[PDB]
Amino acid sequence: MAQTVTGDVAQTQYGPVQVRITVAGGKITKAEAVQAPKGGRSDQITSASVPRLNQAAVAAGSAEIDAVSGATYTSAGYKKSLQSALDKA
């Protein structure tokens, strides 16, 4: 069974983060931020951080992933949204 699930939007101090994943036989095979902080240096931080989070979500198969340093708000919002996705099953 393969399925795509979108997690709840996490409000952060720098704006919304929202993660979507494909799970296939349970494991994460695709990860993306549907929403991420934008505007000003938040673009730089988003650019920096979310591709790394995405990669770490696909490698982890779980929301037990490490916060990106210097992007702790975005990372915390990413994991909450990703955990939300996993919980939807």
Author numbering: 1 to 89
Article passage:
The second domain of SaFMN3 (SaFMN3-D2, residues 157–244) and the first domain of CbFMN4 (CbFMN4-D1, residues 26–109) could be overexpressed as soluble proteins. The SaFMN3-D2 (9.4 kDa) structural organization consists of three β-strands forming an anti-parallel sheet (residues 2–6, 18–24 and 27–35), followed by two α-helices (residues 41–60 and 72–87) connected by a loop. The FMN-binding site is located between the N-terminal parts of the first helix and second helix. Most prominent is the hydrophobic stacking interaction of Tyr14 on the si-face of the isoalloxazine and Ile45 on its re-face. Furthermore, hydrogen bonds are located between the O2 of FMN and the backbone amides of Tyr73 and Thr74, the N3 with the Thr74-Oγ1, and the N5 with the Oγ of Ser42. The phosphate group of the FMN is clearly covalently attached to the Oγ1 of Thr72, which is located at the start of the last α-helix. The structure of SaFMN3-D2 shows that FMN closely interacts with the side chains of Tyr14, Ile45, and Tyr73. Especially the benzylic moiety of the isoalloxazine is sandwiched between Ile45 and Tyr14, which may lead to quenching of fluorescence. The highest fluorescence quantum yield among all mutants was 0.07 for SaFMN3-D2-Tyr14Ala/Tyr73Ala and SaFMN3-D2-Tyr14Ala/Tyr73Ala/Ile45Ala. These data suggest that the Tyr14 and Tyr73 side chains have a fluorescence quenching effect on the bound FMN. When inspecting the crystal structure of the SaFMN3-D2, no clear binding pocket next to the isoalloxazine moiety can be identified that could bind an organic substrate.
